[PDB]
């Protein structure tokens, strides 16, 4: 069958009741299973026979079947439940999967605590200077990180990495790494990191030499 999973994504705060619907195009095989694929891990079996809770699966998850619309229910959303969820049919050796439903955890909008790190004395001796800017425990995911060197805006020499959603407070975390040569770092004084969320922008800075 053609497992049509609805919706393709959704966001819900902690404690919400979450429903994901998976509709089989034309089938009567009650054998339908639910899985949870956390980012970067293998799919974890949750519900089999579209009713039975695999051993070791939290209560909150429950399964049902509206004839063709097999539904997965999370009674009380926990921050750990953020993941992508898939539904799976097994007809005559016909294992078909749904397109997938990503679940993000909504949370009260919060600003990041920002720290800036000058490159270490060791890394300077090697010849490369990496200045790293940290955005800690903020929501939502999106932001604008800009690098400034002596009030001159930098571009193309930065790499950013964002953590997955925190499984306790539902917030993110981001690190922007600015890479420069030793000679370039020794040729400037003012290093600043600017972060822009909505109507608010914050800038941490350090001056080469100030101790």
């Amino acid at each position: 069958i053609q497992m049509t999973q609805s919706p393709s994504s959704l966001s819900a705060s902690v404690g919400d009741r979450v429903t994901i619907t998976c509709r089989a195009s034309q089938s009567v095989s009650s054998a339908v299973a639910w899985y949870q694929q956390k980012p970067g891990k293998a799919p974890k079996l949750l519900i089999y026979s579209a009713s039975s809770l695999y051993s070791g699966v939290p209560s909150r998850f429950s399964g049902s079947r509206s004839g063709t619309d097999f539904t997965l229910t999370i009674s009380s959303l926990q921050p750990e439940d953020f993941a992508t969820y898939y539904c799976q049919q097994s007809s005559y050796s016909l294992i078909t999967f749904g397109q997938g439903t990503k679940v993000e955890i909504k949370r009260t909008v919060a600003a990041p605590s920002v720290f800036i790190f000058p490159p270490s004395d060791e890394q300077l001796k090697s010849g490369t200077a990496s200045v790293v800017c940290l955005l800690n425990n903020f929501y939502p995911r999106e932001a604008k990180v800009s690098w400034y060197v002596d009030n001159a805006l930098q571009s193309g020499n930065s790499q950013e990495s964002v953590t997955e959603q925190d499984s306790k407070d539902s917030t993110y975390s981001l690190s922007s790494t600015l890479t420069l040569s030793k000679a370039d770092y020794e040729k400037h004084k003012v290093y600043a990191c600017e972060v822009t969320q909505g109507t608010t922008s914050v800038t941490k800075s350090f001056n080469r030499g100030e101790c």
Partner: protein, 219 residues
Amino acid sequence: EVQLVESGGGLVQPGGSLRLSCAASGFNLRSYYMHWVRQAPGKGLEWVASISPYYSYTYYADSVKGRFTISADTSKNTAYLQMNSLRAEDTAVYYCARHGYGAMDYWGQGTLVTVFNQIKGPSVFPLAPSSKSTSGGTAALGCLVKDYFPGPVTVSWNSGALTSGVHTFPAVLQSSGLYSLSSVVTVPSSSLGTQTYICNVNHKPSNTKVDKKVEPKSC
């Protein structure tokens, strides 16, 4: 405990050949239905193939039927996935899982299979003979093979009749990751007026054959 370990991943060109391995521990692999599932980077789940305990009834997805082979070796307690006629869509993380009840109970860590920079037909440009190049009664002409992937390209001249003076150069790797070369032949300066000269380039990877007739340069 019940543990599925996968190995054999890497990068291969379209076609190629890759045998993914899936070794099991804590259970007899000959006593369970075993499945192969792939996940394209940033995409959904697609079932690849399956095999039956003992009976060894192999099942395949229609997207791989005729290219992939799933086999199991009871002695090593390991299941395998042989991958031939690989394509761009075959780029995914491949997992091996064990059938439990009516689902997949245990899963492996998954190993990645990646396709190369994809096939690319060559571009053929004429190395135009000129009177300025024309040296006494010896003129030179050729036709350039540029930006092809992967190798090789077979270049011949005038359907293979022209052999004397033909010089096909070894392929280079341009900075764009694309192979390139050229083939030239020296001709009598008088023959420029009458003898037509066609280069025969064949790219079996792309199943493309180009035939360009090199001709005097003009404005």
